[PDB]
């Protein structure tokens, strides 16, 4: 019998590492179905904000206009998605954009040659002014009521150092990109995670004792922190299983072709969530759980 | 098309949540069938996959000029040693998990980078 | 022609890394693997993206239709 209590008694979380960008925790005694559901919801259905509808006034740059629009829409934005709501479809496109769900990112740049251009200067950082357009140049501007709401939030790209376009003197860019809420399953630019994946904990079943120099090489097959030599009795024991990446270098040697089995525990996942800069991986996982729960709840309460 | 005559039309844009994934956490961007290899007999594609993974892992570039090897120094062994020194499988196989069933696949999947 | 904002296979941003990679490679005797390690790229999906970018926009810019040559 499986019950909610019989699952709560055995399930556990071991947050091995944490950071504002990358988490690495463990889900134990949970089903591969639910762990995979969390992973997929996390990588696709967790909302985020990225520019969608660009507006271009001039683009004399070498970069094609649509290529620049794609690059601009790609860049992550250090915006909490919960600060702005969702956009409409049936509403007129002149009126679908409110001050509660849209972020405007102007970018006005004009490359001009540096009059004090040194002789023998090859690096363009001296020969031209504003030759390189960086994502820092995307300058958020408040609209309507945004002044008294997003004041403390310095809306900037989650990376201000991503390169947008390389210019030449005379060439100009002048655009305004509207940002809205979206999800990863729609377009890969809304995915709030650089990655989100797990792996079952490797299992190393040593059947016959490995003693002497044989255990010394048997340890060298695995990563350095996986197998250890016992102090007193010269042997091999599994020191840290998580540290092992399953490469099966042992199986290439016949002396270990019958002394070890490389199994794998089927209920012990090792998640690793890297935020794209928009949020933090602990909150990404929290919202993945909340999305799965709200999805099951909406299915439950939806009339049949 | 690969650089070994392995042409083929794209048949579906497979969503990344449905793509298979590995322990490292990468969905391959190109999926090709293994059954294209027996009749077509292109071991060059396999060794290019091996060399590409090894080169991207070690940060280096792989030469592929014909007849630099012999039957005593197999490119399979060469790029396998360079993968074992990097920590991956000597035979190029990456243990993948299916992005739909969540379960690990029956055996380790041959993955790599190719042009 | 110009460095992509996001790595194709995963999504790890490699577009804020091209100048850093070039500087690491030219200022010191850093090999490409070491530079890609120090730049935050440990999976080969990210590593090849900056190991194998051509930056053809340099050759592209040298034909300016708005400058005397």
């Amino acid at each position: 019998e499986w019950n909610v209590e019989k699952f709560k008694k055995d399930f556990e979380v071991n947050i091995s590492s944490l950071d504002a960008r990358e988490a690495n925790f463990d889900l134990i005694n949970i089903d591969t179905s639910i762990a995979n559901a969390f992973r997929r919801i996390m990588i696709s259905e967790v909302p985020s904000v990225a520019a969608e509808y660009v507006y271009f006034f001039n683009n004399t740059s070498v970069i094609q206009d649509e290529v620049l629009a794609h690059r601009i829409g790609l860049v992550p934005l250090k915006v909490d998605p919960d600060m702005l709501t969702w956009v409409d479809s049936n509403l007129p496109d002149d009126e679908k954009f409110t001050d509660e769900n849209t972020i405007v990112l102007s970018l006005n740049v004009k490359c001009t040659r540096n009059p004090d251009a040194p002789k023998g200067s090859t690096d363009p950082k001296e020969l031209y002014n504003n030759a390189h357009v960086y994502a820092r140049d995307l300058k958020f501007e408040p609209q309507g009521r945004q002044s008294t709401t997003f004041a403390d939030c310095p809306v900037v790209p989650a990376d201000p150092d991503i390169l947008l376009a390389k210019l030449r003197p005379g060439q100009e860019i002048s655009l305004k990109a509207h940002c809205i809420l979206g999800i990863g399953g729609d377009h890969a630019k809304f995915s709030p995670v650089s990655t989100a994946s797990y792996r079952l904990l490797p299992q190393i079943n040593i059947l016959q004792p490995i003693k002497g120099e044989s255990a010394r090489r048997f340890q060298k097959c695995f990563p350095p922190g996986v197998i250890g030599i016992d102090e007193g009795s010269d042997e091999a024991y599994v020191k840290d299983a998580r540290k092992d990446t399953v490469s099966r270098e042992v199986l290439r040697y016949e002396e270990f072709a019958d002394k070890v089995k490389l199994g794998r525990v089927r209920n012990h996942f090792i998640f690793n969530v890297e935020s794209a800069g928009a949020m933090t991986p602990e909150e990404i996982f929290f919202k993945s759980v909340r999305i799965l729960k709200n999805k099951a709840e909406y299915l439950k309460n939806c009339p049949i | 098309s690969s650089r070994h005559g392995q042409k083929g039309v794209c048949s579906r844009k497979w969503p990344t949540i449905d793509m298979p994934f590995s322990e490292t956490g990468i969905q391959p961007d190109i999926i090709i069938n293994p059954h294209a290899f027996p009749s077509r007999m292109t071991i060059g594609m396999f060794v290019e996959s091996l060399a590409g993974k090894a080169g991207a892992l070690h940060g280096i570039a792989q030469d592929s000029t014909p007849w630099i090897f012999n039957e005593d120094d197999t490119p399979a062994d060469y790029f396998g040693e360079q993968l074992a020194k990097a920590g991956y499988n000597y035979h190029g196989n990456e243990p993948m998990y299916s992005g739909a069933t969540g379960e690990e696949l029956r055996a380790d999947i041959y993955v790599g980078v190719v042009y | 022609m110009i460095v992509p904002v996001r790595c194709f296979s995963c999504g790890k941003v490699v577009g804020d890394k091209w100048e850093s990679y070039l500087n690491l490679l030219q200022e010191d005797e850093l090999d490409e693997g070491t530079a890609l390690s120090r730049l935050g790229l440990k999976r080969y999906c990210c590593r090849r993206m900056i190991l194998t970018h051509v930056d053809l926009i340099e050759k592209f810019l040298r034909y300016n239709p708005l400058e005397k040559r």
């Binding site: 792996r199 998580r242 540290k243 990446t245 090792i270 | 090897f69 005593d72 360079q82 020194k85 920590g87 | -």
Partner: peptide, 19 residues
């Protein structure tokens, strides 16, 4: 014919997640 030269000084690149 000497064999293909070996790229020496190669270290361990793949560390498990969290490592």
């Amino acid at each position: 014919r000497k064999d293909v030269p070996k790229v020496e000084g190669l270290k361990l690149e793949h560390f498990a997640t969290g490592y």
